Amino acid sequence: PQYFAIIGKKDNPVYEIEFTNAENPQGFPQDLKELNPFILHASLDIVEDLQWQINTDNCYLGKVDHFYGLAITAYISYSGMKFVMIHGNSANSSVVIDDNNMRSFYQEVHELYVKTLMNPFYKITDPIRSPAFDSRVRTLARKHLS
């Protein structure tokens, strides 16, 4: 499974969603489900550590943090918006992240975020409540994630 979140400068999520593989349509079983926000909160500190560092690209950080068989990848926009993903095995594996697919996914989701931000009524603090945004994000996950 995969757990994706978009977080602003004040360390609050403006969007959150979880993806599955369609042979085990339950997500993380019961415990990682409770632990996901906390581990993502922990990894945000490393993401902020890499935010201001010299050494090419610096928006896509790739694998930054590690946990109990969980790979954590981070992408950073220009307005400090942090895009964080947590990859989980299929109950047994050593998860390896596809560099190009994750890069392209973050690129397209950043396109979605910027064109969400453009309208007059949106504010940085407010969350991205939109059926269209969720729909296009999840079909994008089908297109690029797996």
Residues 75-134 that bind another protein (CB under 8 A): 76-80, 104, 107-108, 110-112, 114-120, 124, 127-134
Contact with another protein (CB under 8 A): which of 10, 22, 92, 93? 22
- The DSSP bridge pattern shows strands 82-88 and 70-76 to be antiparallel
Helices (H), the chain: 31-51, 99-117, 131-144
Shortest separation between residue 96's beta carbon and another protein, angstroms: 16
CA 78 to chain centre: 16
Using DSSP's 3-state secondary structure scheme, residue 3 falls into: strand
Q: What are phi and psi of 107, to 5 degrees?
A: -60, -50
**Which of 29, 45, 89, 98 touches another protein by CB under 8 A?**
45
Q: Which is nearer to another protein, 77 or 95 (CB)?
A: 77
63 counts as binding another protein under rule CB under 8 A: no
Nearest to 146 by CA among 27, 8, 1: 1
HSE (side-chain half, CA atoms, 13 Å) at 27: 13
Number of residues forming the site for another protein (CB under 8 A)? 71
Shortest approach of another protein to residue 90 CB, angstroms?
Answer: 13
CB of 69 to another protein, least distance (A): 8
Q: What does the alpha-carbon distance between residue 24 and residue 40 come to, in Å, rounded to a whole number? A: 23
Among 7, 19, 86, 88, binds another protein (CB under 8 A): 19
- Looking at the Cβ atoms of 87 and 110, the one nearer to another protein is 110
Task: Work out how close the CB of 117 gets to another protein at its nearest, in angstroms, rounded to a whole number.
Answer: 6
Question: Are the C-beta atoms of residues 35 and 45 closer than 8 Å to each other?
Answer: no
The least CB distance from residue 98 to another protein, in Å, is: 15
